[PDB]
Amino acid sequence: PAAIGGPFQLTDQNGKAVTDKSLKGKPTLIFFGYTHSPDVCPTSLFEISEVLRAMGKDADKVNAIFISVDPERDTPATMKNYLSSFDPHLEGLSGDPAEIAKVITSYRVYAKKVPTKDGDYTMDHTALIYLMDRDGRFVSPFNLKRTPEEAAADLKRYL
Amino acid sequence: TGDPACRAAVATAQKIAPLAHGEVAALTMASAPLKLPDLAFEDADGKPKKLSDFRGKTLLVNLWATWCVPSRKEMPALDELQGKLSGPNFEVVAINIDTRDPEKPKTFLKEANLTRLGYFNDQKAKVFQDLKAIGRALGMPTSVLVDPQGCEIATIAGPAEWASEDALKLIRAATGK
Numbered sequence: 001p002a003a004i005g006g007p008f009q010l011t012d013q014n015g016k017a018v019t020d021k022s023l024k025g026k027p028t029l030i031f032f033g034y035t036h037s038p039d040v041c042p043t044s045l046f047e048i049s050e051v052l053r054a055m056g057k058d059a060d061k062v063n064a065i066f067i068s069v070d071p072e073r074d075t076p077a078t079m080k081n082y083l084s085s086f087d088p089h090l091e092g093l094s095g096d097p098a099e100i101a102k103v104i105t106s107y108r109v110y111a112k113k114v115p116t117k118d119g120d121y122t123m124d125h126t127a128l129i130y131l132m133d134r135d136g137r138f139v140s141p142f143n144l145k146r147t148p149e150e151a152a153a154d155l156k157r158y159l
Numbered sequence: 160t161g162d163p164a165c166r167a168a169v170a171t172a173q174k175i176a177p178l179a180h181g182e183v184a185a186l187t188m189a190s191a192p193l194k195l196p197d198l199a200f201e202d203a204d205g206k207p208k209k210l211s212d213f214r215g216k217t218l219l220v221n222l223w224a225t226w227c228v229p230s231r232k233e234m235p236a237l238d239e240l241q242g243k244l245s246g247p248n249f250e251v252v253a254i255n256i257d258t259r260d261p262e263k264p265k266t267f268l269k270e271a272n273l274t275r276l277g278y279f280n281d282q283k284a285k286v287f288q289d290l291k292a293i294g295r296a297l298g299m300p301t302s303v304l305v306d307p308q309g310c311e312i313a314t315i316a317g318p319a320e321w322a323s324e325d326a327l328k329l330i331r332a333a334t335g336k
Contacts, residue, residue: 037228037229038228038229039229039317039318040229040298040299040300040316040317040318041224041226041227041228041229041230041298041299041300042298043287043291043296043298043299046224046226046284046287046299049258050258050284050288053258082226085224085225085226085257085259086226086259145291147288148288
């Protein structure tokens with residue numbers, strides 16, 4: 001019962017099916033967040049984007065997977081418009097509350113609603129990046145507190 | 160170990176601290192001396208710029224991006240803040256860090272008639288890397304109020320009503336000389 005990760009079936013920004021099994025065969029970055037406009041922007045998606053950019057053509061040899069923790073507001077359509085400002089290798093995943101809830105359980109993601117006082121809320125979340133191997137097994141968190149060049153060089157070790 | 164030249168910036172932070180309320184309540188005043196890294200970027204004409212080119216004036220350094228909605232929401236206030244206080248002693252240095260479609264942020268300013276901010280940019284977004292490394296880029300936008308010595312006076316992660324009288328008062332007090 002103490003292992004990070006589990007099975008899932010979601011839908012990417014292009015309406016295509018992506019699962020934990022389709023993510024096998026490559027080192028895989030899994031991380032969590034939301035698209036819908038907050039008062040302050042989290043930087044995880046942009047930082048991964050910069051790592052992917054630093055990887056050049058090797059960005060193809062890894063999976064970089066962004067999963068909504070806010071299924072009630074995030075759709076493939078919302079993901080797609082949002083992801084268009086970041087590296088095109090990125091994948092943004094959606095689904096009904098039950099499949100997101102199922103992924104949230106397996107990865108032990110903190111995700112709670114935080115009213116933003118202007119009338120809406122922010123989905124406060126685990127900002128951690130999960131490294132999974134070619135078999136979808138948890139390796140470690142992936143460190144972003146370094147230059148995208150140092151992070152990229154790290155990720156190339158698994159290639 | 161805090162750079163001794165930035166101790167004067169520390170002193171300013173303690174004086175204007177009572178003005179860090181209301182619209183500028185989310186400002187975290189510097190409590191230790193911090194010399195900013197010499198951010199390297201370009202102006203509208205593609206000439207290389209550094210934070211040290213602006214030595215001698217108090218600065219407001221902002222990092223913005225099109226993908227960051229609140230960063231692009233607060234561009235008018237920063238523009239209104241400029242020209243209201245810009246002069247021999249103050250400038251807003253708003254730096255765009257879009258890495259794709261470099262025409263998109265340029266078009267934003269023109270179509271919104273924001274002409275007092277110029278167009279400083281770093282499509283490498285290394286200026287983002289620079290602030291992140293020293294714990295001053297906790298989110299976007301991020302803004303640092305910088306003294307004539309390149310030393311940190313204060314920092315805010317997120318947007319603010321910069322054209323409000325609450326915002327204006329702290330900057331005016333911070334400013335010198």
